[PDB]
Design a protein around this ligand. Sequence first.
Ligand SMILES: *[C@@H]1O[C@H](CO)[C@@H](O[C@@H]2O[C@H](CO)[C@@H](O[C@H]3O[C@H](CO)[C@@H](O)[C@H](O)[C@@H]3O)[C@H](O)[C@H]2NC(C)=O)[C@H](O)[C@H]1NC(C)=O
Ligand SMILES: *[C@@H]1O[C@H](CO)[C@@H](O[C@@H]2O[C@H](CO)[C@@H](O)[C@H](O)[C@H]2NC(C)=O)[C@H](O)[C@H]1NC(C)=O
Ligand SMILES: *[C@@H]1O[C@H](CO)[C@@H](O[C@@H]2O[C@H](CO)[C@@H](O)[C@H](O)[C@H]2NC(C)=O)[C@H](O)[C@H]1NC(C)=O
Ligand code: NAG
Ligand code: NAG
Ligand code: MG
Lengths: 957, 365
Amino acid sequence: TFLPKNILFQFHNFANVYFLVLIILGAFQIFGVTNPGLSAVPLVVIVIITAIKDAIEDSRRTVPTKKSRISRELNFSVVINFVLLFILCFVSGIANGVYYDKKGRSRFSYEFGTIAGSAATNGFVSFWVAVILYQSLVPISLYISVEIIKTAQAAFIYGDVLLYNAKLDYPCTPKSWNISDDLGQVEYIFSDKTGTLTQNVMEFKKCTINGVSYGRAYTEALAGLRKRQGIDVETEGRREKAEIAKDRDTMIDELRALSGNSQFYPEEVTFVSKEFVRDLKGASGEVQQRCCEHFMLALALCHSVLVEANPDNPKKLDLKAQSPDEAALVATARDVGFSFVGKTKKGLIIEMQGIQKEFEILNILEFNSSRKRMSCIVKIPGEPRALLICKGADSIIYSRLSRQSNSEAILEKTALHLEQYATEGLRTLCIAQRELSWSEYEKWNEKYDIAAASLANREDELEVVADSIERELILLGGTAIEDRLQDGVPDCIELLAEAGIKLWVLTGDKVETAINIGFSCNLLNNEMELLVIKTTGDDVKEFGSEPSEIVDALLSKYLKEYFNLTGSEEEIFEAKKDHEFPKGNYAIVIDGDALKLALYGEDIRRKFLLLCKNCRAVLCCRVSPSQKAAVVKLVKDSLDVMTLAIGDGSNDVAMIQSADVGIGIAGEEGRQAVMCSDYAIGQFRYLARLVLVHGRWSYKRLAEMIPEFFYKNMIFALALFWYGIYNDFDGSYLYEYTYMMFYNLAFTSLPVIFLGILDQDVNDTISLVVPQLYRVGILRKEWNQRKFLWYMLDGLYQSIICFFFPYLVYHKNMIVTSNGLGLDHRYFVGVYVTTIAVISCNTYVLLHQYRWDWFSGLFIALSCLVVFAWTGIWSSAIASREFFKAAARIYGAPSFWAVFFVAVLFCLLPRFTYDSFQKFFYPTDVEIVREMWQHGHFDHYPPGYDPTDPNRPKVTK
Amino acid sequence: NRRPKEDAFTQQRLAAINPVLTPRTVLPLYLLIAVVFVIVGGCILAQNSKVDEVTIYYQDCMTNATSSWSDIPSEHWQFVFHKYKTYNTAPQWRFVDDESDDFTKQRGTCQIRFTTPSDMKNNVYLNYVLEKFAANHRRYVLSFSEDQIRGEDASYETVHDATGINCKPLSKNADGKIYYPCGLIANSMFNDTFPLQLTNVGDTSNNYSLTNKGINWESDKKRYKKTKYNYTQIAPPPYWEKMYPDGYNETNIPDIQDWEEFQNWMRPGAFDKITKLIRINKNDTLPAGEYQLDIGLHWPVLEFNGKKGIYLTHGSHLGGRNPFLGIVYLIGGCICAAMALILLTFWLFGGRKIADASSLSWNMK
Ligand SMILES: *[C@@H]1O[C@H](CO)[C@@H](O[C@@H]2O[C@H](CO)[C@@H](O[C@H]3O[C@H](CO)[C@@H](O)[C@H](O)[C@@H]3O)[C@H](O)[C@H]2NC(C)=O)[C@H](O)[C@H]1NC(C)=O
Ligand SMILES: *[C@@H]1O[C@H](CO)[C@@H](O[C@@H]2O[C@H](CO)[C@@H](O)[C@H](O)[C@H]2NC(C)=O)[C@H](O)[C@H]1NC(C)=O
Ligand SMILES: *[C@@H]1O[C@H](CO)[C@@H](O[C@@H]2O[C@H](CO)[C@@H](O)[C@H](O)[C@H]2NC(C)=O)[C@H](O)[C@H]1NC(C)=O
Ligand SMILES: *[C@@H]1O[C@H](CO)[C@@H](O)[C@H](O)[C@H]1NC(C)=O
Ligand SMILES: *[C@@H]1O[C@H](CO)[C@@H](O)[C@H](O)[C@H]1NC(C)=O
Ligand SMILES: [Mg+2]
């Protein structure tokens, strides 16, 4: 399962088959110029390394695949490299043929050679010997280097400690170890709300019992409403939360003074009504008391929660429910003093006010996604009767009312309370009872039994019996649950918005409460326009008659008014090129039907995409999973851009898979969004630290690392081409074979690999303090093809220098030694050239590193020293044939060191001078920030500084 | 649990320096390198000017030289004496034909007289100089046998069917004997006979003596060894058949360990100009005077318009006389100085503030 598949997948490239052709040409069709038994070492070692590493890859995958944009640019780079190698070999062959044309030379005399008529044959042999000569110009270690670098970057992303969430015991486990650098170019983020931005634990906040609306709270949607209006939300909330904390303390005190509860726990109490805790005793009398107790009893009975002992203490219960809202209701009913324990063969057990009492549940018409309600008939002993209690939606209940048994005095005020809760941003419920005397209950029970006795899709008869029986109800009131944001979500959102990332939030909540929660999350802020595409009656009757054209009119107006362009293919093509952060501070808000009708047709899709190209913030309300996937793919496919999609659950999985980067929010249970993702973080907050720090880092690291490589190898390779000019392109090597293999195996590999692994322009603290540094990665400036072409031109020039400086030290009289003895063998000029080239390349890498850390410095020094030591060790062994004492004869010549130092100076002077001219008179943002860092502007921030952590100390400015 | 190990390496918080290059830091380095490189370049150039050389190309002897002494044409010699920048005193040469030798292509003796007006220290090197002899071609350079060089009695298969380094075109003769020094390299050796002394024309009682013991690295005697062949399995290369007209008998087999002109030849010059030491003198200075060198023409070069010559020097520590190192050190130091001056000019004219947040690409617009 390893050897066949791995060796085939490895040889499926062009570089690998090229080197295999080279091995076969050196061994099977040997012309006579090769050391074949050892020329097969680079191929076999890279094959073994890739085989081991891919074995580890598949092992990690066991216990679809994506590719970054850098990889496709890398394919194009390798294509240009091969074009250059072919041009070199073409010129070699042509010139060797034109040479063998000549009719009087040293060869006819001393080489036993003849005039091979139609010299094109020797030209062809020379082409195929130069193909093997210019080995090192084939990028063969490039792919294994990029793979090592990406694996190391993903291991750093994993083993980062500021991403491990201690509550979940879940570090940021990467599921794709080759998109780290794609993390550094994110330009759009698509984020589900309910599970991602808000901790998906619903807490019961308020309730309107018998027209009395108990409950006081400061919700994030209320805070957002206050912020949008203009009130100082900071002081408003400080006062409100202090008041409510004092009220909660006194509420728990009064609750303890009321009665002794065995299942009371103040830590998970969320009902904050001092009015309720005071009115339960005597404040309104007996009728409101009875209403409240009946509300609590019905809330604590009508449910499907299964309770089990707490692993810490067996007396505490865990309240294991299926839906969060039912769990919240039963938990608050327990904490108020109506606890529910156990589940016997008949009914259930409630501890009310401290005493046990059992019930008899007969028929639980369970909750269904299509019924939108959960009902239950309990037997009340005393002459027992039937109590049909049903919990559902407000409209669901208001559709099923009785023509007489409605107060219509409590109903109006309860509806007002429900509307106020919906405005404040809470999920509302409705609860309705029905009292059934003994005779009518006997009749209805026999009818229900004979109706359920009908099989063959009993659901139809069941729903018709439900329609017949639940038409008359007596509503008691409503509840309200709250979904709080996760810790640090507003800070993370403002960080990602300063970084230049456009943010999309895909909600399931109503438009106005979504806008309020956005203002609370800082997705939208003040001095930011809200372009709404609501298809409400006020815009319908003013624009058109039917939808799907009101939205088109609205898109056209919001384009033509707040910019000067209209939806067109040329405007799409133009905006495809720009990535600048938009100015003007606009935002879009769109409903589910409007999004559907904007995704329907092609021109409307074009207009919607051009409008959302600007408008750094976009809110979509009441969307579907299909719509999530559709908007992600519309933003990605057209307008080719890098997209991240973060979510949880089972619809955000379809949202995640159709995106460049997919981030899953891990719950206490492993979910599909986690599994079918690319990365998996504990909380949305961590997305800031990931995307900025690592994103940017990886992106820069790869960027600067790739041209480096394409330059380093070039130097060496091209030097051989230059020796071609002086040996008439005949195919003799200027380098020893161990030199030609180790220049890529050991001499110049670790410097560029460590540049790609460990480099940091600014540390993580500055990365998170000045997030705008991300904008360059958004704009795609650190990695183009022009950068690679400039690095290759520099490599060509440095190869010219590294060859023609030793050649020029020889050219006068071929005596370069102090004792007049000879060093004129071509392996010795090759030692000259190789040492100059290696030291130039490693010092280039060092000068282009941003951070000179001791690991990188040690290994650059070791690469240079290993060049010197390999020369010294291979010479001193007699097994080197014509290379016997290259070390003791070259490193002991002052000519060698003179050329060495001046040639390294001449190789590094143009690039260093240009870098100085840049850092002086056209500095970039990271250079300005590094100067501000040297002057000490970032000294007060601690080393590990996450500005998105609530339990963190603030700084001066 | 699964908490990642807090560690200075895995958290990427290694000890490091972050070198930002401000003019106050770079310009001093530019000036320092400029100063040291200008000083070293001037020192190298001044120490190099003191190097005197004599080059004489005698390939045109068999046709231009006569039986009586005559001036050498100005194209064939190059004198460089630093005390006397205007010293021509053209050398002379005379050809002594040898009708006994039947190799009409190159035979006789070239006698050259040259007048050195200054001494030559105490370590004098007399190299020969081949021009346009292509000793760097693909098949040539690989045509020898490291099994014979090391002294083995390698059979025909070890000598012929070895790997890349093998004497293929000259592996065997017609009679069935392996060429002892095989291959195009050892076969095409340089053949002129150089004298063991420089005859003094004025005072013939003090002749300047030369040697051929010490013209090659001593370490090379660990790689070359005396053969173990049997004088019946070996025969001279096709071109050594004037030096061994009867073949190898029990006495004439060439011991390549103590034969350093061979060892110098088996090191194929990388480029088109070949300069190999052939004579040395490590004891006596070469006093000013008129000296005579008698070379026995054996090696043909006019077939391919090549050149052969003598090159007599004392040398230097950087080898012969070559102004490239000093010139390029001076150019490097002066380019560093020029660039430092240009950067300082543009700084004192249009120099921004260093740590100014107001210059950042977003705080600007
Ligand atoms: C010194 O080295 C000379 C350089 O090789 C060498 O010249 C070579 O001499 C051989 C004969 O000794 C010639 O061989 C052929 O000569 C003619 C012309 O083809 C043929 O009739 C012969 O049968 C034989 O095949 C080489 O051609 C010749 N090499 C060159 C380049 O001309 C001298 O012989 C050497 N002399 C001494 C004294 O060592
Ligand atoms: C210096 O070298 C010259 C080279 O010729 C020597 O002169 C030769 O000496 C020998 C004696 O054995 C004579 O047979 C030659 O005729 C001389 N040649 C010439 C051209 O004069 C001279 O002997 C050497 N000096 C010393 C002190 O030995
Ligand atoms: C320089 O002096 C040294 C030592 O006197 C010479 O080396 C010796 O030379 C003789 C022949 O002249 C040899 O027999 C010895 O084996 C050499 N010994 C060593 C240790 O080298 C050397 O030849 C002199 N150089 C010149 C040019 O005359
Ligand atoms: C020397 O060679 C040159 C170049 O061919 C020629 O013009 C000149 O006449 C020659 N001198 C003698 C003396 O042969
Ligand atoms: C060995 O060969 C050489 C070749 O020049 C010859 O001069 C010498 O006399 C030979 N020795 C014997 C013992 O035959
Ligand atoms: Mg969700």
